[PDB]
Amino acid sequence: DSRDYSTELSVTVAVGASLLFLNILAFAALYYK
Amino acid sequence: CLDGKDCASFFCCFEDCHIRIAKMDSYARIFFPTAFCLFNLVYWVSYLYLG
Amino acid sequence: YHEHYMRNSRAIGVLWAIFTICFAIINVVVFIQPYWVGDSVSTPKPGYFGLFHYCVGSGLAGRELTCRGSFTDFSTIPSSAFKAAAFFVLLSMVLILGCITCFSLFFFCNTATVYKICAWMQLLAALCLVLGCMIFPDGWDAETIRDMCGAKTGKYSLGDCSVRWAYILAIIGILNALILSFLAFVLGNRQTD
Numbered sequence: 567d568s569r570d571y572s573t574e575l576s577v578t579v580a581v582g583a584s585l586l587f588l589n590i591l592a593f594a595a596l597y598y599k
Numbered sequence: 600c601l602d603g604k605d606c607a608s609f610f611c612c613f614e615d616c617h618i619r620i621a622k623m624d625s626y627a628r629i630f631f632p633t634a635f636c637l638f639n640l641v642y643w644v645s646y647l648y649l650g
Numbered sequence: 651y652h653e654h655y656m657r658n659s660r661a662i663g664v665l666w667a668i669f670t671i672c673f674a675i676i677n678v679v680v681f682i683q684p685y686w687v688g689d690s691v692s693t694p695k696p697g698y699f700g701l702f703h704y705c706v707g708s709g710l711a712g713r714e715l716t717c718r719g720s721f722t723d724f725s726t727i728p729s730s731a732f733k734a735a736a737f738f739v740l741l742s743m744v745l746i747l748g749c750i751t752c753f754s755l756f757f758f759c760n761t762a763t764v765y766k767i768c769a770w771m772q773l774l775a776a777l778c779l780v781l782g783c784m785i786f787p788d789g790w791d792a793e794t795i796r797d798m799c800g801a802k803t804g805k806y807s808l809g810d811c812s813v814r815w816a817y818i819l820a821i822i823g824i825l826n827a828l829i830l831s832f833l834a835f836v837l838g839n840r841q842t843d
């Protein structure tokens with residue numbers, strides 16, 4: 567088997583960045599007076 | 600600061616709460632079923648599907 | 651102006667709770683799934699391991715992944731650092747689940763008070779997850795982990811092995827917990843107006 571985990575680390579980062587981006591968008595909503 | 604609130608004014612809600620103890624049963628009629636239902640969901644999913 | 655204010659506050663609170671449930675799912679997944687560190691091409695012998703559970707190959711050009719470990723029985727955890735990390739991640743999971751239960755208080759208790767409650771509980775869960783992630787590498791000196799990865803592996807030294815999706819997902823969970831805690835604090839201070 568290809569014992570490489572680059573692909574899985576890659577996908578894990580995309581989902582994490584999406585969640586963090588949505589959270590910073592929530593901050594953009596609230597902090598905007 | 601962010602909201603002009605000092606540590607105490609922004610983080611701890613030590614301004615009201617205790618006083619609200621007569622409604623202790625009011626919380627329990629929905630707090631306890633939520634905790635048990637939530638515990639079952641993590642318990643059953645963990646042992647049956649995740650591992 | 652006030653109706654827009656209330657509508658945005660309500661919607662952002664709903665999204666905050668949705669992301670709280672998502673972070674709880676993340677915490678459960680990283681706690682259960684044993685893919686925090688994994689083998690590499692240069693690793694002497696294959697497998698993977700998480701906070702407490704570890705699967706190791708027999709080493710005869712096949713899988714035969716013998717698996718061992720369980721948080722219920724602390725005897726089989728390789729090292730005290732692993733035990734501490736698993737306990738801290740469990741405590742973080744219990745804290746975030748407690749916040750999801752405390753969502754029920756929105757009927758009776760004041761919105762600002764419950765927002766501050768979950769803000770503090772999410773911050774504590776974040777702190778517990780941070781300590782778990784910082785303490786977990788300390789146990790890499792264990793004889794099982796060294797036998798897996800090799801002699802070059804050690805305390806806070808990855809060595810030949812490679813971090814898999816669960817570790818980076820736990821770091822993402824730490825970041826999510828911090829941002830959600832600050833979000834809850836801001837929402838609690840915002841409902842007061």
Ligand SMILES: CCCCCCCC/C=C\CCCCCCCC(=O)O[C@H](COC(=O)CCCCCCCCCCCCCCC)COP(=O)(O)OC[C@@H](O)CO
Binds near residue numbers: 660
């Ligand atoms: C799979 C895992 C599932 C886990 C299960 C999760 C469920 C856990 C149990 C119960 C949730 C209870 C939610 C009840 C929310 C009720 C919120 C509500 O009452 O409406 C108003 C807005 O509140 C607010 O903005 C606070 C926002 C509350 C948001 C939380 C509920 C959303 C749940 C959406 C489901 C998403 C699931 C998706 C998962 C994939 C406040 O009222 P009110 O002015 O009169 O009070 C003022 C005071 O002086 C007297 O009450």
Ligand SMILES: CC(C)CCC[C@@H](C)[C@H]1CC[C@H]2[C@@H]3CC=C4C[C@@H](O)CC[C@]4(C)[C@H]3CC[C@]12C
Binds near residue numbers: 637638642720744751
């Ligand atoms: C009271 C509410 C809010 C929170 C309840 C927390 C629950 C879900 C926690 C507390 C103790 C936890 C268990 C502790 C140990 C183990 C052994 C492990 O090998 C699989 C997960 C499992 C079986 C956990 C599943 C989740 C669990 C049951």
Ligand SMILES: CCCCCCCCCC
Binds near residue numbers: 637644674678679
């Ligand atoms: C109720 C907290 C979230 C529980 C999630 C259980 C694992 C989901 C795997 C898809």
Ligand SMILES: [Cl-]
Binds near residue numbers: 719722
């Ligand atoms: Cl187990």
